[PDB]
PDB file of C-alpha atoms in Angstrom:
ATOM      1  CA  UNK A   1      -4.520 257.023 159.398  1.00  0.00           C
ATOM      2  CA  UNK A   2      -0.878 256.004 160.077  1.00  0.00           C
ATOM      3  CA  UNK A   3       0.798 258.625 162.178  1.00  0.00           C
ATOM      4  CA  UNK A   4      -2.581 258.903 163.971  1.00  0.00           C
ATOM      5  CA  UNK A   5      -1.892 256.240 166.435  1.00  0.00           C
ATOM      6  CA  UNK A   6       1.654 255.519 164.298  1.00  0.00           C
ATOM      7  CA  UNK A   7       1.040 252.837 162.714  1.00  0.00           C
ATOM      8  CA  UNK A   8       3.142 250.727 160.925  1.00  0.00           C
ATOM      9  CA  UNK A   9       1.950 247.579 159.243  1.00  0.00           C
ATOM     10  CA  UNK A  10      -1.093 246.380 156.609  1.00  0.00           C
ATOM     11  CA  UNK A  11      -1.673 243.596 154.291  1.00  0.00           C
ATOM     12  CA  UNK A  12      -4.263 244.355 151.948  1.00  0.00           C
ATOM     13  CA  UNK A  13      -6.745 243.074 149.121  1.00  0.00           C
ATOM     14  CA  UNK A  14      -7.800 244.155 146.100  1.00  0.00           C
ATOM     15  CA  UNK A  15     -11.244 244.186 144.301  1.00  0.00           C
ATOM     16  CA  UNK A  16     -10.010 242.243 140.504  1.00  0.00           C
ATOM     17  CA  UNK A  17     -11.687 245.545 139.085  1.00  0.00           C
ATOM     18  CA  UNK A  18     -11.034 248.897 137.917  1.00  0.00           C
ATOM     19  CA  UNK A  19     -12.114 250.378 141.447  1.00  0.00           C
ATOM     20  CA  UNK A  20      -9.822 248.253 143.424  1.00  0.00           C
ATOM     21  CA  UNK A  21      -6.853 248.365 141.249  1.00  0.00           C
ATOM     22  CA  UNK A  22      -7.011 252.121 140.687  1.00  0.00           C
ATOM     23  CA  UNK A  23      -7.516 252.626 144.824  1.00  0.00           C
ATOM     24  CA  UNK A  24      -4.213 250.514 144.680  1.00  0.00           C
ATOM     25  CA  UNK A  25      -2.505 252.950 142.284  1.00  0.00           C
ATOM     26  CA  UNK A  26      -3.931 255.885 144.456  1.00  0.00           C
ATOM     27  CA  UNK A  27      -2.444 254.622 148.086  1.00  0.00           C
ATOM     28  CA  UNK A  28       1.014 253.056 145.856  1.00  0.00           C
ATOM     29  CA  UNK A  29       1.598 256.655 145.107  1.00  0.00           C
ATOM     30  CA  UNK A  30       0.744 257.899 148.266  1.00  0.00           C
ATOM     31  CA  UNK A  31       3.164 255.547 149.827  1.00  0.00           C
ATOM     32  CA  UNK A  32       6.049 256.813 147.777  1.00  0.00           C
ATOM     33  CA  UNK A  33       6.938 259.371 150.744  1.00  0.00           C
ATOM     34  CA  UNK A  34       9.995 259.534 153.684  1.00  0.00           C
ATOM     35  CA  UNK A  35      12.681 261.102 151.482  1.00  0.00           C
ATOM     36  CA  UNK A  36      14.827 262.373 154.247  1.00  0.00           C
ATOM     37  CA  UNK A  37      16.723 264.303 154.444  1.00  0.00           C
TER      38      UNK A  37
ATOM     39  CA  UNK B   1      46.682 232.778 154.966  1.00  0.00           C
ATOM     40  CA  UNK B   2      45.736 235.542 156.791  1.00  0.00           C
ATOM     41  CA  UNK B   3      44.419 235.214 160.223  1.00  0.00           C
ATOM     42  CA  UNK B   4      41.950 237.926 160.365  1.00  0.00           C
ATOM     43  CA  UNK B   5      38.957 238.236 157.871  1.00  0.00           C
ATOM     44  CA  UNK B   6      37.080 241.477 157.171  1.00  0.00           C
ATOM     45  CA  UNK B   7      36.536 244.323 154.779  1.00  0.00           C
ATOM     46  CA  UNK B   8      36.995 247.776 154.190  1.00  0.00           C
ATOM     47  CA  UNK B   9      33.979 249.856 153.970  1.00  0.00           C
ATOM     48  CA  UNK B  10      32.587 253.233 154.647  1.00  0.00           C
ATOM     49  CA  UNK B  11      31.025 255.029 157.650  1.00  0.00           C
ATOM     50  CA  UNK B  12      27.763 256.730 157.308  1.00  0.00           C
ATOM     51  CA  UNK B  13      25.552 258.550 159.842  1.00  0.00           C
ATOM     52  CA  UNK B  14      23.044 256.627 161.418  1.00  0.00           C
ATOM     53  CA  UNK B  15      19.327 256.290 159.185  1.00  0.00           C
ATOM     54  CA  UNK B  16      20.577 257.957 156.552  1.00  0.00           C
ATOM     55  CA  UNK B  17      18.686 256.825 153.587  1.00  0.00           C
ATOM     56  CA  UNK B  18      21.365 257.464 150.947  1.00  0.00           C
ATOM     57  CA  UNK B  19      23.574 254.845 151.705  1.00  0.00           C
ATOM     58  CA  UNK B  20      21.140 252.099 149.912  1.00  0.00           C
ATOM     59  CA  UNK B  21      22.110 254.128 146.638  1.00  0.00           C
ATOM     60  CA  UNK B  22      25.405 254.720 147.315  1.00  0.00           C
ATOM     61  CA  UNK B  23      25.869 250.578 147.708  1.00  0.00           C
ATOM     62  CA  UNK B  24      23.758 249.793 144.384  1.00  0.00           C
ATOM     63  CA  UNK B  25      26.529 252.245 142.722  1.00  0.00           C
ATOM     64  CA  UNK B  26      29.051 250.200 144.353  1.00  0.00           C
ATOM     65  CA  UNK B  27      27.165 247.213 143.087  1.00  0.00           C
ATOM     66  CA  UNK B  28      27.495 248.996 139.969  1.00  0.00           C
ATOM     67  CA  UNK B  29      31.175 249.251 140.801  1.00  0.00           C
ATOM     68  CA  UNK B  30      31.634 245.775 141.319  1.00  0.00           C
ATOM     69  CA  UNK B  31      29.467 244.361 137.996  1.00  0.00           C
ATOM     70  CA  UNK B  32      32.087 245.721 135.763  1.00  0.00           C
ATOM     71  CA  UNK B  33      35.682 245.171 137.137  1.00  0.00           C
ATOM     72  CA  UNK B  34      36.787 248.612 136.931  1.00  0.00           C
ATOM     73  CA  UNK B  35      38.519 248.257 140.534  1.00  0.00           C
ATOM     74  CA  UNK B  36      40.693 245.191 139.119  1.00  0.00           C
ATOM     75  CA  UNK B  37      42.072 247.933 136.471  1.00  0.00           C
ATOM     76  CA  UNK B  38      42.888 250.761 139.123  1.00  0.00           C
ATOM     77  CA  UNK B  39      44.563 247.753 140.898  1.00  0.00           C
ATOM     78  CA  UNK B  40      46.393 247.724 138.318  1.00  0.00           C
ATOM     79  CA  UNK B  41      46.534 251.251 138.316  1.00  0.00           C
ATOM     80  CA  UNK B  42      47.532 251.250 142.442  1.00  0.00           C
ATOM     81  CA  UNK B  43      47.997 247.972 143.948  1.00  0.00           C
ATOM     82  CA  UNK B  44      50.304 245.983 142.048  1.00  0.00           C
ATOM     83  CA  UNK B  45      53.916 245.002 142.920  1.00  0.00           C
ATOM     84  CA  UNK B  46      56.977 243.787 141.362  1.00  0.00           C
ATOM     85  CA  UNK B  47      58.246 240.350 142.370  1.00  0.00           C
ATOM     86  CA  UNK B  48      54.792 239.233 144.506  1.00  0.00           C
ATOM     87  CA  UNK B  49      53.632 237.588 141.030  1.00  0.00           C
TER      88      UNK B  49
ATOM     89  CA  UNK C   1      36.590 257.323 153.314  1.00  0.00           C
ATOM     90  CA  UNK C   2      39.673 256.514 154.795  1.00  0.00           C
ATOM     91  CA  UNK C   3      41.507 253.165 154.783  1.00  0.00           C
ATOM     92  CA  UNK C   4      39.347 252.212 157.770  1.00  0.00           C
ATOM     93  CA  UNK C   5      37.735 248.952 158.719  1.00  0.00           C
ATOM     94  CA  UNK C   6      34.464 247.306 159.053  1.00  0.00           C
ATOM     95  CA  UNK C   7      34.374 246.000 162.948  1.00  0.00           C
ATOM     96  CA  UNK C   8      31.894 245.092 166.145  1.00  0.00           C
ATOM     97  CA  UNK C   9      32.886 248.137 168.148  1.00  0.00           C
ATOM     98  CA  UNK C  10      32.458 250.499 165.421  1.00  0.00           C
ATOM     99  CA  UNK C  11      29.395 249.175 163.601  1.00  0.00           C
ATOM    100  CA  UNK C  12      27.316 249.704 166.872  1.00  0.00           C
ATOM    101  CA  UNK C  13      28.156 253.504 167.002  1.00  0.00           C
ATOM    102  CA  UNK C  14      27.514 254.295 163.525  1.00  0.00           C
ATOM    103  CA  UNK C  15      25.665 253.330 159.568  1.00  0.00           C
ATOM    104  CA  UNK C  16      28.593 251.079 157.728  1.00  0.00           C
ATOM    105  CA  UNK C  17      28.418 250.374 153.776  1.00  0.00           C
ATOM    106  CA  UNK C  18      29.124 247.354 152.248  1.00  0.00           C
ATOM    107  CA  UNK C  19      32.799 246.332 152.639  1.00  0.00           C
ATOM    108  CA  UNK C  20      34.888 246.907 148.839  1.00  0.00           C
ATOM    109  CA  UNK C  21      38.403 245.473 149.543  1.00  0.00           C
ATOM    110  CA  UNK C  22      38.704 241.940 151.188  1.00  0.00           C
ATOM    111  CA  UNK C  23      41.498 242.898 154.012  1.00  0.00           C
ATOM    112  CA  UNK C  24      42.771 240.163 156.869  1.00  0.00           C
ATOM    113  CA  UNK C  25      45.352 240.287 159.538  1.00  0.00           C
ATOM    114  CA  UNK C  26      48.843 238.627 158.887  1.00  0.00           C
ATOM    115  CA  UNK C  27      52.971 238.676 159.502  1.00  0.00           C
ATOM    116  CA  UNK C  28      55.445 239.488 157.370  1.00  0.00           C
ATOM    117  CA  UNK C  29      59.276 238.421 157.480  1.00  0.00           C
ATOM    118  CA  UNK C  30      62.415 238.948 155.722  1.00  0.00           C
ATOM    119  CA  UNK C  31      63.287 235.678 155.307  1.00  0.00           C
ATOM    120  CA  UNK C  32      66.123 233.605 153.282  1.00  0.00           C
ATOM    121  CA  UNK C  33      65.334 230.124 153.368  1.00  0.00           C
ATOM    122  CA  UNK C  34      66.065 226.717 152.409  1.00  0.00           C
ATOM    123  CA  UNK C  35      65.937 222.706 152.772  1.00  0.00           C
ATOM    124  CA  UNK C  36      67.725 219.631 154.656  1.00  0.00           C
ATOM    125  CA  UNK C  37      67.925 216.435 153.235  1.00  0.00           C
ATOM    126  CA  UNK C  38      68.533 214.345 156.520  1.00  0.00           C
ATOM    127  CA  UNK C  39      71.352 212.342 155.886  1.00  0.00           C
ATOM    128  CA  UNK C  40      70.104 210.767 152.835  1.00  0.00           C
ATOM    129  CA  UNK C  41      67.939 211.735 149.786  1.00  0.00           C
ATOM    130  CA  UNK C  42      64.884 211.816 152.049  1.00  0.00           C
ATOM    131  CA  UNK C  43      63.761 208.248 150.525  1.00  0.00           C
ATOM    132  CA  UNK C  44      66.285 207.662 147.859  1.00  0.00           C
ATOM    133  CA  UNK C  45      65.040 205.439 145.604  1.00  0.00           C
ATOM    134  CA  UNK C  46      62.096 202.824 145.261  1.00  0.00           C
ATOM    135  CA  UNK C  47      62.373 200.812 148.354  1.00  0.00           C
ATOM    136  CA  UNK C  48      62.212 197.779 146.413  1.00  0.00           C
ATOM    137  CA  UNK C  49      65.590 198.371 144.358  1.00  0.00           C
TER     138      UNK C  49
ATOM    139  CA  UNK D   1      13.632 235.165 133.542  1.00  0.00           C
ATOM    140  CA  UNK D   2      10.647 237.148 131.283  1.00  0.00           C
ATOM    141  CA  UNK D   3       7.212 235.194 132.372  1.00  0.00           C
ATOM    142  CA  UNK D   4       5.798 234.434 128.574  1.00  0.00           C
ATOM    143  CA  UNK D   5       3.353 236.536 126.692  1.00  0.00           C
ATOM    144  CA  UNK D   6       3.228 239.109 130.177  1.00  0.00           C
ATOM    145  CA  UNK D   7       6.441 240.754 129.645  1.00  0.00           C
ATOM    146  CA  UNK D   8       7.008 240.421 133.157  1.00  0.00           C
ATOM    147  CA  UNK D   9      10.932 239.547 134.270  1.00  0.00           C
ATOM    148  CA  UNK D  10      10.350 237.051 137.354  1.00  0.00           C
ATOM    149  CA  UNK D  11      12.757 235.325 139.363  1.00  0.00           C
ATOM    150  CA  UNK D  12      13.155 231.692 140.036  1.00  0.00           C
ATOM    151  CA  UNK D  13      14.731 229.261 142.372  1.00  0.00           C
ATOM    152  CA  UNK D  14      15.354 230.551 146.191  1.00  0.00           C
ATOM    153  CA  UNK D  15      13.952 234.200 144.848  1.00  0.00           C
ATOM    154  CA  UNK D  16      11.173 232.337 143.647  1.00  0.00           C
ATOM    155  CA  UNK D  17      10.339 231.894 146.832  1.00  0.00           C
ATOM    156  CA  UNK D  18      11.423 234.330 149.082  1.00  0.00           C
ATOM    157  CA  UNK D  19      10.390 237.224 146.962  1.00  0.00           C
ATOM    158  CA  UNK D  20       7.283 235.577 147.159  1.00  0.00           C
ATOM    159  CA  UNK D  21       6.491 235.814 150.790  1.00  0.00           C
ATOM    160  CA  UNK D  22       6.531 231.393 150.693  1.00  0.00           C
ATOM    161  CA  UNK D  23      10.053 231.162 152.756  1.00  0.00           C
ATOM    162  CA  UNK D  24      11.378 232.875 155.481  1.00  0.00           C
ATOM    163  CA  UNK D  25      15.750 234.028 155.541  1.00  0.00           C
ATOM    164  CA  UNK D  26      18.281 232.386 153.352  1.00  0.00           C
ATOM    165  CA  UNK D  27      21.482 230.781 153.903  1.00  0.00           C
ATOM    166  CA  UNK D  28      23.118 230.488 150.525  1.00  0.00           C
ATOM    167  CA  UNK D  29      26.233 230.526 148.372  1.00  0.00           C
ATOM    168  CA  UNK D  30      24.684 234.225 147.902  1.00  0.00           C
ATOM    169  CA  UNK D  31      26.335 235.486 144.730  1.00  0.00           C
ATOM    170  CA  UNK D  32      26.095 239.388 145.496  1.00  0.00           C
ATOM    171  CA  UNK D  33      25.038 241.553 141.978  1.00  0.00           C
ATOM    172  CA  UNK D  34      22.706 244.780 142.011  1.00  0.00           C
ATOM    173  CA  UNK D  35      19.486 243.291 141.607  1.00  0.00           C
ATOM    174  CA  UNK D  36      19.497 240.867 144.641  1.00  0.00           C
ATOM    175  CA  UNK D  37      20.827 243.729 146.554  1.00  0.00           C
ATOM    176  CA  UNK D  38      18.137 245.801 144.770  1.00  0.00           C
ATOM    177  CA  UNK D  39      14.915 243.380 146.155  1.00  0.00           C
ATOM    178  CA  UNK D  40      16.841 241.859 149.164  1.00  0.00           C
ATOM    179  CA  UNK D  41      18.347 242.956 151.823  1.00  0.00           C
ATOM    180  CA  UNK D  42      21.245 241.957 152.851  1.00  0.00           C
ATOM    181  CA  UNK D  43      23.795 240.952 155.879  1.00  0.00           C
ATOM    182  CA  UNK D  44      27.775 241.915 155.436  1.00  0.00           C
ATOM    183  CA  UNK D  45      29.431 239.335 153.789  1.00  0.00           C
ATOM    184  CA  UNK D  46      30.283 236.167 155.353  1.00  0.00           C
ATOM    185  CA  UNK D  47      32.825 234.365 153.162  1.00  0.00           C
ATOM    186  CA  UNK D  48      34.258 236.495 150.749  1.00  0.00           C
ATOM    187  CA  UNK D  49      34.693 235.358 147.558  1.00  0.00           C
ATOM    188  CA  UNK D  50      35.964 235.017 143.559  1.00  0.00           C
TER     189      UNK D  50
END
């Protein structure tokens, strides 16, 4: 969803439970990006 | 006393994400006092003491 | 990496690292020099004597 | 400093704070090593130092 309408900016909260903390671990990862060049 | 006060540094291109590693090695640089010894090595004079 | 240094002018146009040597504008002089003691020794003794 | 039985290395005083999100910028005596360069950024130096 960011880079659809570029954007730039989210706080978030998590679920105290497995589902929430592993959906963190998912997105932390995904965010691990922009190595140029 | 010197008039002036600034610092020698180095140029880099313009968002160029490497320079945030290249100062923590300079951090790295500076947490062990090896530049004090190549002053010693370089920059050190003969009646300034 | 040249001797160059950190400034206004040149830190618009392009990325700078964090500055390494602590550099300043001065003079220098080759100097002799020396003292006057104005016509007596400056205070010569304790007043009070 | 190592939070007790977490093994969890957090920092106090100003970074206490700031790393926190509770303050906003800092005007210091900053003391300049890796690791506050490593979780804040920071301006050129200001008063250089020893």
């Amino acid at each position: 969803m960011m880079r659809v309408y570029n954007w730039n900016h989210i706080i978030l909260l998590v679920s105290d439970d497995h589902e929430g903390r592993a959906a963190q671990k998912r997105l932390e990862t995904l965010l691990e990006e922009r190595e140029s060049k | 006393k010197v008039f002036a006060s600034t610092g020698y540094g180095i140029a880099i291109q313009k968002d160029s994400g490497w320079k945030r590693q290249v100062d923590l090695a300079i951090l790295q640089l500076f947490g062990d006092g090896e530049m004090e010894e190549l002053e010693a090595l370089w920059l050190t004079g003969i009646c300034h003491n | 990496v040249g001797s160059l240094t950190i400034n206004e002018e040149r830190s618009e146009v392009v990325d700078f690292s964090v500055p390494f040597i602590e550099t300043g504008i001065s003079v220098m002089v080759s100097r002799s020099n020396g003292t006057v003691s104005p016509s007596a020794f400056l205070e010569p003794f304790s007043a009070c004597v | 400093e190592r939070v007790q039985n977490s093994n969890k290395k957090e920092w106090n005083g100003m970074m206490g704070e700031l790393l926190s999100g509770q303050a906003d910028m800092i005007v210091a005596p900053l003391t300049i090593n890796n690791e506050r360069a490593q979780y804040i950024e920071f301006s050129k130096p200001f008063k250089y130092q020893g």
